[PDB]
């Protein structure tokens, strides 16, 4: 038997989050050996039943799609007996924890009429999105994602260093001190230039003056998605603040 775990991204956050958590709950106890692959890794299981126990564990912690197949080996004629060799192909949802995602138009209208230009927040059993301009969350169960897949707009490797000038909070707060209008300037343009950007962001309370934050920088990026092309350009912000550094 074999559970084959796969994730298509070059940098796999949830997949490495899986290996740290597979050791905490003491899950892989019934392995024979562990092989690895280009896209993920493989687990070899002696009996049939120990493989299904892992998939019930994987369903709780990471959004997967799985299916099964088999191979015949012996076909003994003296009794009806199997000697079958099973294979479970498991694939993680290919969006990482903190990417930039542009949703499809019909899908974004059903999840509470969120805007299409959202982040990812909390990546869980289910996939959770966040609108960084106005705080509003929307969940995405894996059965809705695999009936119509889509790709991340930008990875973690596109983050750009920013330097914050001050924080102007609007006093709205769901759970993260919503909509602090951060006046932010580029790390690379602070030295010799006078160029200042102006953006609402969910990083409300944790940010002060002179702090280094990372962010997606839309103003120079030529994306080639048809979803991003089917937008209204003058409603797209220049800066999406992602995370505070250090």
């Amino acid at each position: 038997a074999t559970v084959q775990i796969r994730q298509k991204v070059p940098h796999k956050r949830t997949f490495l989050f899986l290996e740290q958590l597979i050791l905490k709950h003491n899950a892989h106890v019934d392995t024979i050996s562990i092989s690895e692959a280009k896209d993920g890794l493989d687990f070899f299981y002696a009996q049939k039943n120990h493989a299904v126990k892992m998939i019930d564990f994987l369903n709780a912690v990471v959004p997967i799609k799985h299916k099964k197949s088999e191979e015949l080996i012996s076909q003994d004629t003296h009794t009806g007996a199997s000697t079958y060799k099973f294979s479970y192909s498991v694939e993680i949802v290919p969006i990482c924890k903190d990417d930039l995602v542009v949703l499809p138009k019909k899908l974004a209208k059903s999840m509470g009429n969120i805007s299409q230009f959202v982040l990812c927040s909390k990546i869980s059993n289910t996939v959770q999105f966040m609108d960084p301009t106005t705080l509003q969350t929307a969940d995405l169960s894996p059965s809705v994602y695999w009936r119509a897949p889509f790709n991340a707009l930008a990875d973690v490797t596109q983050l750009v260093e920013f330097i914050v000038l001050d924080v102007d909070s609007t006093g709205i707060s769901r759970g993260n001190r919503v909509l602090a209008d951060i006046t932010v300037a580029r790390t690379s343009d602070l030295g010799v230039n006078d160029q200042v950007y102006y953006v609402r962001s969910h990083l409300g309370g944790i940010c002060h003056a002179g702090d280094s934050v990372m962010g997606y920088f839309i103003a120079n990026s030529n994306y080639n998605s048809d979803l991003f092309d089917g937008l209204n350009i003058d409603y797209v912000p220049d800066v999406v603040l992602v995370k505070k550094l250090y």
């Binding site: 690379s188 030295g191 120079n220 990026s221 030529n222 994306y223 080639n224």
Partner: protein, 102 residues
């Protein structure tokens, strides 16, 4: 990448035929602009019973566009185009590089 806003290159506009100063901006596609020939044929053919009659492209793999620059001469205003390779980050003008810094 990063290109300067001003580039001195060869112009061909029947009076210059020499390296003159050009301005650099970024090429924009333009409006779809119906009453074109293919659009009037498409709206006639879709009309009626039969549903979708043209292929609709789905399986897209690329992630970048090539970058096109419209070089505009400052004397004769004879615009000319020039292409670049595929790149993810394209800004023009700022961020001049200095190699020795802290």
């Amino acid at each position: 990448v990063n290109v300067p806003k001003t580039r001195k290159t060869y112009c061909k506009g029947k009076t210059c035929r020499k390296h003159t100063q050009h301005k650099v901006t970024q090429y924009k596609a333009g409006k779809a602009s119906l009453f074109a020939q293919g659009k009037r044929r498409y709206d006639r053919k879709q009309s009626g019973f039969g549903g979708q009659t043209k292929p609709v492209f789905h399986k897209k793999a690329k992630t970048t566009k090539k970058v096109v620059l419209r070089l505009e001469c400052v004397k004769c205003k004879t615009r000319a185009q020039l292409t670049l390779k595929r790149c993810k980050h394209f800004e023009l003008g700022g961020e001049k590089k200095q190699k020795g810094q802290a």
